[PDB]
Amino acid sequence: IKELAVDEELEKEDGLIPRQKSKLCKHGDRGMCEYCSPLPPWDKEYHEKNKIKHISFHSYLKKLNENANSYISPLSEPDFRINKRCHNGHEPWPRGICSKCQPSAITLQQQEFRMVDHVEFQKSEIINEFIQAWRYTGMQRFGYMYGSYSKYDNTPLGIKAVVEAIYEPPQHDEQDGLTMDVEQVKNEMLQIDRQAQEMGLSRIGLIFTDLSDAGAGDGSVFCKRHKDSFFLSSLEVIMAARHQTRHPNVSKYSEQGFFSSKFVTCVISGNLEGEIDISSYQVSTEAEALVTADMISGSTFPSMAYINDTTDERYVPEIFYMKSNITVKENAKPAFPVDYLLVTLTHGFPNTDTETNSKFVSSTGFPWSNRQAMGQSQDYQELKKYLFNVASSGDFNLLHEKISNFHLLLYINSLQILSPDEWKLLIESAVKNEWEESLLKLVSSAGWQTLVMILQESG
Amino acid sequence: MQIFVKTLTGKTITLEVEPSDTIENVKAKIQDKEGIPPDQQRLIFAGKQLEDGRTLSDYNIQKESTLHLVL
Amino acid sequence: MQIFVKTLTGKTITLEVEPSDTIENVKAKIQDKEGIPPDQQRLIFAGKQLEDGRTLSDYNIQKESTLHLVLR
Ligand SMILES: OC[C@H]1O[C@H](O[C@H]2O[C@H](CO)[C@@H](O)[C@H](O)[C@H]2O)[C@H](O)[C@@H](O)[C@@H]1O
Ligand SMILES: OC[C@H]1O[C@H](O[C@H]2O[C@H](CO)[C@@H](O)[C@H](O)[C@H]2O)[C@H](O)[C@@H](O)[C@@H]1O
Ligand SMILES: OC[C@H]1O[C@H](O[C@H]2O[C@H](CO)[C@@H](O)[C@H](O)[C@H]2O)[C@H](O)[C@@H](O)[C@@H]1O
Ligand SMILES: OC[C@H]1O[C@H](O[C@H]2O[C@H](CO)[C@@H](O)[C@H](O)[C@H]2O)[C@H](O)[C@@H](O)[C@@H]1O
Ligand SMILES: OC[C@H]1O[C@H](O[C@H]2O[C@H](CO)[C@@H](O)[C@H](O)[C@H]2O)[C@H](O)[C@@H](O)[C@@H]1O
Ligand SMILES: OC[C@H]1O[C@H](O[C@H]2O[C@H](CO)[C@@H](O)[C@H](O)[C@H]2O)[C@H](O)[C@@H](O)[C@@H]1O
Ligand SMILES: OC[C@H]1O[C@H](O[C@H]2O[C@H](CO)[C@@H](O)[C@H](O)[C@H]2O)[C@H](O)[C@@H](O)[C@@H]1O
Ligand SMILES: OC[C@H]1O[C@H](O[C@H]2O[C@H](CO)[C@@H](O)[C@H](O)[C@H]2O)[C@H](O)[C@@H](O)[C@@H]1O
Ligand SMILES: [Zn+2]
Ligand SMILES: [Zn+2]
């Protein structure tokens, strides 16, 4: 019922692609003809010629709606789970089975559309500070990306995830790899989600490192992920599917009210030239459904998803996949390249020419959370070193720069010294385009002056 | 009424006090349940250092208010 | 009493200490069982950085409190 602003706006756009006028046009400036009429936003051939690997969601949505032409919602998510409430002349699964309740054979295929087209990191310092954790410790790291979604104009009806900050939960890089799907992470992130919502930020994706120094003394790294190994592993694909399912995308045009997800998955790793690069992905709605039905697992090989057994808990039908040499239909069992579950996105930073719109002025200078293993603790000393001097000075431009900082804000809020109203005021002083009036109100406020008092004597 | 006292370690202890209570009286009320001698206690409310002479209502410390305790 | 210390390895280890114990003593109690030398340990308690001289009762560290271990 309540869609994101970007979805309401793209819905109103027609997405028509203009075409070159042709020597064959024999109308004047009077109307169009078969040679010069515009392309619809999903034009397969326009996307191939311009190397756009998937059509956008809203280009896909408009394609489905032309093909609908009484109402039937054009979008519905796949469900592969056996119908367990079937009491149709037999006991329910696992005691009985019939054609109404068992899932039919599944055919997996590369998804022609992607929910999000592009990942824009608002400043490259956001990426560099995140990578510092690997530079200092040698451990791979993961964080959750906060931001929002808006229009992307390099592809018809495109959407981009605009990343404003990265938050790292508690993690250790040990015998189980990176561990995101654990209670400790989930309960801390619920708190962060709540506080970053108060900053006008959503949790929009996941980023993690797979970095290995190449031994060349030039900062270069090994290329581990590429077309002849794997892009994301099976286990990472399964994790993206759970994340997407837990970050559902709201859509009027789906019977359930939800359709797939705008949550994006980025990996920082070496490219074929040995440079540290970013690769961005989402998984298909088939992958979401497979993982909801608990049908796949990690396999010996990173590029291969393993297909699970029918049990008394889950029923697994035949599963095929459309492989391209031109295509052909293969049996997906016992394992299949998890590639077919991915969609790929582009990524970038805004050009440095124009004015910035980043919510936060700085992304570094104050310790990020959960970097004790890096010698970065969030202390009353560290906050005093960061803030107290500048706060006493009475320089508003400098005070604005220092508090316009995601992890600084979250840390101050955790101290629970400012009131909820005063916390709103600090937030406004940090992210607002017109922040002066808010910063004044805040600095004269009671909670704020208590905080400056606490730092003063904290020493 | 009831006022909160919050140390720097995050722990928040509740107090039963009157608006007429002296701040010295509130420092005793912290010591008895937390064992902390009043000379080590510096109470802060609203960016001001509280004074043993004044009262809670001199500083407009109403119900469900939160003092901060620094050692 | 029992106090928790949260290390660099993700681990949270329980510790048996008394209110009169020094912080230097607690750093040794971490060293033997977690292998981290007292000079590499920087102990923090809820945003207060501890000192080898004082004791747990000086910092109002009661039972079931949690110290944080930071590298250096
Ligand atoms: O005169 C400019 C008007 O059209 C602009 O958009 C162009 O591209 C659209 C793609 O669908 C077309 O539908 C539209 O007719 C084209 O002109 C834009 O909408 C505005 O600047 C003006 O309405
Ligand atoms: O490693 C950082 C390099 O780029 C910075 O310059 C800009 O980089 C991005 C655009 O590509 C911006 O988003 C970022 O905010 C700018 O700082 C840096 O200044 C360069 O010195 C570095 O080579
Ligand atoms: O890579 C480890 C080094 O990290 C810091 O240096 C980097 O980050 C600074 C602040 O962004 C940059 O000014 C500097 O150019 C980067 O190299 C740290 O200060 C170094 O001591 C570490 O060796
Ligand atoms: O297309 C939806 C909205 O996109 C923009 O707003 C988003 O991106 C901004 C960049 O910082 C954020 O400040 C804002 O919070 C996001 O919602 C656009 O400015 C809006 O007008 C659109 O509604
Ligand atoms: O004790 C098992 C722990 O490992 C889990 O990690 C993942 O990798 C496993 C082996 O490759 C998979 O079987 C499993 O499905 C994955 O989730 C996990 O991190 C831990 O919580 C488990 O205890
Ligand atoms: O980011 C690379 C890691 O991917 C896997 O771990 C994630 O996915 C698992 C389920 O497939 C979750 O249980 C786990 O909590 C996630 O972190 C893999 O198991 C790790 O070894 C990889 O480092
Ligand atoms: O200093 C410019 C920004 O990007 C930097 O990239 C550096 O990464 C390493 C620093 O430890 C070194 O390989 C070398 O200084 C650069 O390649 C730096 O990481 C960032 O902190 C800066 O924002
Ligand atoms: O505004 C047009 C484009 O802006 C970005 O790209 C430019 O700025 C980047 C930051 O240095 C450069 O890396 C890039 O090469 C520039 O062309 C944005 O990333 C693009 O998608 C926009 O089309
Ligand atoms: Zn024509
Ligand atoms: Zn049945």
Residue numbers in the entry:
A (entry chain A): 113 to 181, 188 to 443, 447 to 580
B (entry chain G): 1 to 71
C (entry chain I): 1 to 72
Wording from the paper:
Eventually, we determined the crystal structure of yNpl4113–580 in complex with selenomethionine (SeMet)-labeled K48-Ub2 at 2.55 Å resolution. The final model contains one yNpl4113–580–K48-Ub2 complex and one isolated yNpl4113–580 molecule in the asymmetric unit. We here note that the electron density of K48-Ub2 is weak, especially of Ubprox. This hydrophobic interaction is further stabilized by hydrogen bonds between Thr571 of yNpl4 and the main-chain NH groups of Ala46 and Gly47 in Ubdist. Ser498 of yNpl4 forms a hydrogen bond with Arg42 of Ubprox.
Polyubiquitylated proteins in isolation can be direct targets of the proteasome, whereas those embedded into membranes or assembled into multisubunit complexes need to be extracted or segregated by the conserved AAA-family ATPase Cdc48 (yeast) or p97/VCP (metazoan) with the aid of its cofactor complex, Ufd1–Npl4 (UN), prior to the proteasomal degradation. The UN heterodimer is one of the best-characterized cofactors.
